[PDB]
Design a binder for this molecule. Structure first.
Ligand SMILES: [Mn+2]
Ligand SMILES: [Mn+2]
Lengths: 546, 546
């Protein structure tokens, strides 16, 4: 019976006037911070080898080349990845005010400050209400005291709020929303971002017409090494993709559909996406609270982006990708040493968050999730009561509506999975050896190892469709081999195992052969079945860790 | 006219008497160090999860599960991986005495001491002359002082010699040979080894008949996490394999050939291998000096193992794998740290070592090496004069003899490579973007990136045979895509590129398509040929490393 507050605010949708440009486009080229280079305007900065040993160090500390970043201006210019028609939209000038919240943890100085400098340089002043930095219990000394003094520049426009304990990224974002009173809309940004020219007007205009639209900018890639900016490779060409997921709830992207394109008169106007990546988005501040922010059961590193996406869509909102508003996000490099917090019940925290989102939102679909991850089936996912009552009090639409009206494409790229026959370890009958993946993927060979019952790479499942699978990958027969190999699976590919529980037999269907192994050397292979080997007898047991 | 000092020892080859045991086989089963567990007799030790936080720490420090090793006896018993008929060989007892040298650097205590305990427990006392530990400049405190005092246990049988600077593994082994004077033969062992029962007699008997035979034991795998022992998966039906190399000089193993089997009366007697893995072997001490030990130009790593193998074979020696003598070596796990020295730019000095071995030993073969690695072609490999004079003074046989008389089977598994047409970066014509691999292998897609001229993943080569290759892998075209992908390669596979330097064109041969790129985002694809396009224009330039 509950509703959302009504739209008091009046706004006019923008108009596209080809060949006439403005009103939010800067008339003349943006002044470089340093003229010219090192890194303007997003021309790559390639260094070394004199800088080699220094660069690798900072990569260990930050996962980014801070050596380069340190010699690029905090006020650098940047390249325009925007489509041309973008330059010809005339916006109302009546946009809601914004607070941008940037959560950070141990962020390198120059990447965090260039982010803030980026926002100040390219957002019209009236609209920028405050920039709230949420320190999620930082370690490093340059982010305390030195930061407090520096921020005095900007005359109190920019504020920082420490967290007593490390709350985690999802909950940190919730605190941000609380700590940022001044703006009408919340604009969230990762702490290693560079925002593009005229990002704001296109981003905030759809929220203005309608307070239950949530806006996401197109997110572009900034090289961790070179600091050049590139768009993501997905979809449309133009290159418009909308956010999706497979049924283990991993984020995937898919091309913008013709069907959506039909809904829109012009190429560059916002479009509907079923879900957001998660780190950067815009909602009206009240409306976010009306959805109760982020489920406060998600511990860390959720799980977060999907929860809000379903809430907004199934409770009467829209989530829209705005092509005309672009933001660069720096992407990490190998060799970083920033580490997971210890957890006794694992990998409970993230997996547990996925189960929370599914159970409340997915409805009948939870079945697809549970056969992609059976390991999660009986996981203590916690109290979900108020979250289910919320959904019922606001008469929110079903996930089934969602999947057929707004998320129609997904099953075309990520097909529904077949139910499971069984899952768990594949252990040697009355032995303590298990088929162990070894983390091998795409072409490598599966081995035997001492059972640990910890799931992980000793966990498998059997399809009704006769696929033997670990994560996304299936095992099949190596050619020319009796060797069992792990590769990428497609719905009708490698339908070649059948498991008889009583027999203790896995049998390859195209040959006649039965799974068999050698205890030393630790090897797994298929040979003509002989009862009384007694290798070739296996059991499958649910791991079911708590 | 230089010659090796002749044999003066008279020794006789052992005799196999089936069904009669002895004479070096232990009479009764080996007593466990701790009765009732854990780790004996090489049962796997499976811990956790109470231990997991602790285990992951020690893996960071050592690359071994030290918490598991720490609770296994230094005197444990292990499993017998030897063939049964190994038990029935009767050896003379006339054998030579031996100094075992164990180089170490920051080795975990319990793995280093269990090695020594292993040797003391299973070597007959008369034959064990000393155990010389070479400390290559370790910093961990448990390896100093605590070690000196513990070692007093063996009444001075065991001795350790510190190195003033970290000399590196190869040179450390040379110092060992100098510092260990007592034995007639040198037995080298990695510092994380467990030697099998009756390893010694079979290992040292062939050196005894003939002072220019060099012996290698079969090297078995000790799991670095649960410490059960597994033989390596190697070709022979009996699991016997002989050491090889591809033409980039990467160590490889191949199955024991039928021809070698005709040469031998028995399944279990020693056999010829063209080269040794490197860490564990046995030579008569004088004879090693007569070969001038290890080329003192070899830098920290990159065998070295090959150098000695060619010396012994081409200067009148034999290198023999002894099945009956087995040694377990612990194999590392991911997560170590675990780190290279900073020297620029050999690069690497390791590549510099390979060129030293090739230039002196390979002869006309150096051509195969140089097209597998052209990057090495003009690398300052250093003074090689005395090493070439050695080969000439001793009248050493040609590599060509070597490859057709003793290493005939290599080119059957690792074919000679086709000459190169060009090699280097693949750069965009009058741009600063280069095709680069991103380190991608086996199925992934090759991208564009800012040129750095550092070789590495922006280095490629083109075959006479029309293969575009990086390391062992090839580029082909993977549909439905028009993207270019890397996979593993075979001599007649993916013969599909031709490069015209003047044209600035790479063209796909099966389609008519030409290599093309989009500068943003950085993408590489093959597209219909057009001459208008500046993309589709490429140079290939030798990157030279000094
Ligand atoms: Mn991030
Ligand atoms: Mn080693």
């Amino acid at each position: 019976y509950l509703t959302f507050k009504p739209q008091t605010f009046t706004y006019h949708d923008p108009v596209l006037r080809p060949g006439i440009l403005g009103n939010f486009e800067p008339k003349e080229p943006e002044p470089p911070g340093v003229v010219g280079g090192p890194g303007e305007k997003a021309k790559p900065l390639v260094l070394g080898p004199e800088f080699k040993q220094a660069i690798q160090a900072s990569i260990k500390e930050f996962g980014f080349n801070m050596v380069a970043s340190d010699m690029i201006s905090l006020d650098r210019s940047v390249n325009d990845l925007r489509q041309e028609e973008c330059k010809y939209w005339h916006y109302d000038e009546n946009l809601l005010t914004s607070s941008v919240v940037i959560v950070f943890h141990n962020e390198g100085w120059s990447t965090l400050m260039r982010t803030v400098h980026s926002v100040i340089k390219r957002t019209p002043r009236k609209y920028l209400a405050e920039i709230v930095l949420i320190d999620d219990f930082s370690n490093k000394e340059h982010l305390k005291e030195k930061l407090d003094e520096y921020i005095k520049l900007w005359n109190g426009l920019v504020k920082v709020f420490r967290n007593e304990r490390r709350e985690g990224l999802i909950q940190a974002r919730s605190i941000g929303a609380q700590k940022a009173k001044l703006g009408q809309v919340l604009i969230y940004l990762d702490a290693h971002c560079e925002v593009a020219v005229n990002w704001y007007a296109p981003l905030v205009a759809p929220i203005s017409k309608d307070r239950t639209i949530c806006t996401v900018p197109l997110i572009d890639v900034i090289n961790g090494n070179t600091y050049e900016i590139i768009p993501q490779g997905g979809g449309d060409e133009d290159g418009y993709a909308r956010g999706a997921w497979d049924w283990s709830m991993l984020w995937k992207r898919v091309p913008l559909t013709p069907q959506e394109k039909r809904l829109r008169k012009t190429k560059t106007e916002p479009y509907r996406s079923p879900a957001m990546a998660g780190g950067l988005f815009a909602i009206e501040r009240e409306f976010f609270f009306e959805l109760g922010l982020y489920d406060p059961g998600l511990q860390i590193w959720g799980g977060e982006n999907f929860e809000i996406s379903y809430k907004i869509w199934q409770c009467g909102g829209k989530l829209l990708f705005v092509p005309c508003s672009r933001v660069g996000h720096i992407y990490r490099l190998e060799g970083w040493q920033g580490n997971p917090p210890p957890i006794y019940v694992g990998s409970s925290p993230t997996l547990k968050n996925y189960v929370r989102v599914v159970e409340v939102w997915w409805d009948e679909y939870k079945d697809y999730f549970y056969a992609s991850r059976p390991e999660s089936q009986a996981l203590p996912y916690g109290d979900i009561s108020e979250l289910k009552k919320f959904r019922e009090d606001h008469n929110c639409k079903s996930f089934k509506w969602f999947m057929e009206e707004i998320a129609y494409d997904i099953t075309s790229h990520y097909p529904l999975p077949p139910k499971n026959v069984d899952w768990g370890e594949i252990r040697g009958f009355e032995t303590a050896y298990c088929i162990d993946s070894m983390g091998k993927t795409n072409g490598g060979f599966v081995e035997l190892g001492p059972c640990h019952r910890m799931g992980g790479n000793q966990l498998f499942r059997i399809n009704e469709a006769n696929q033997l699978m670990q994560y996304d990958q299936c095992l099949t027969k190596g050619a020319d081999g009796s060797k069992v190999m792990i590769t990428h699976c497609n719905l009708n590919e490698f339908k070649e195992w059948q498991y008889f529980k009583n027999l203790h037999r896995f049998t390859h269907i195209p040959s006649g052969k039965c799974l068999d192994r050698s205890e030393v050397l630790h090897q797994v292979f298929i040979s003509n079945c002989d009862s009384s080997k007694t290798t070739q007898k296996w059991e499958m047991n649910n791991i079911h860790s708590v």
